[PDB]
Paper text:
HP1 proteins function as structural adapters which assemble a variety of macromolecular complexes via either N-terminal chromodomain or C-terminal chromo shadow domain. In mammals, chromodomain-containing proteins are responsible for gene regulation related to chromatin remodeling and formation of heterochromatin. It has been reported that HP1 proteins mediate gene silencing by dynamic association of the chromodomain with methylated histone tails. Besides methylated histone H3K9, [name], also known as HP1γ, can also bind to methylated Lys26 of histone H1 and methylated Lys185 of [name]. In this study, we determined the two crystal structures of the human [name] (HP1γ) chromodomain in complex with methylated histone H1 peptide and histone methyltransferase [name] peptide to elucidate the structure basis for the recognition of [name] to those two proteins.
However, [name] chromodomain was found to possess strong binding affinity to both di- and tri-methylated H1K26, with a stronger binding affinity for the tri-methylated mark (Kd values of 21 µM for H1K26me3 compared to 52 µM H1K26me2). In the structure of [name]-H1K26me2 complex, the dimethyl-ammonium of K26 is accommodated in a hydrophobic pocket formed by three aromatic residues, Phe30, Trp51, and Phe54. The side chain of dimethylated Lys26 is stabilized by cation-π and van der Waals interactions within the aromatic cage. Residue H1K23 forms both main-chain and side-chain hydrogen bonds and salt bridges with Glu29, Asp68 and Cys69. H1A24 is anchored in the groove by Glu29 and Phe30 of [name] through main chain hydrogen-bond interactions. In the structure of [name]-H1K26me2 complex, the main chain of Lys22 at position −4 of the binding motif adopts a rotation of about 90° relative to the structures of both the [name] peptide and H3 peptide. So that the side chain of Lys22 can be precisely inserted into the binding groove. As a result, the conformation of amino acid residues before the “KKAR(K26me2)S” of the methylated histone H1 peptide shifts from the positions of its counterparts in histone H3 peptide. The hydrogen bond formed by the side chain of Tyr18 of histone H1 peptide with Glu29 of [name] stabilizes such conformation. Thus we proposed that specific binding of [name] chromodomain to H1K26me2 should play an important role in H1K26me2 dependent gene regulation, and even development and differentiation.
Numbering used by the authors:
A (entry chain T): 18 to 29
B (entry chain A): 24 to 81
The structure:
Amino acid sequence: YPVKKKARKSAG
Amino acid sequence: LYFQGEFVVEKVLDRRVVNGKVEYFLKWKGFTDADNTWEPEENLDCPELIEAFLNSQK
């Protein structure tokens, strides 16, 4: 599961 | 549910402003370009990719 270089989706 | 939480970002490709919010156009790791999305700043945790993108533009 990512801990860096990541983002959450508007779709969620 | 399946779109919740966080996913690995591969690339930051562009920036825009919508209704007072800055969004970045993202390529997601493991996905094709067809799945690229615009996401608001508050959704992001990819500061090295954002920096690289802005530097690339001058």
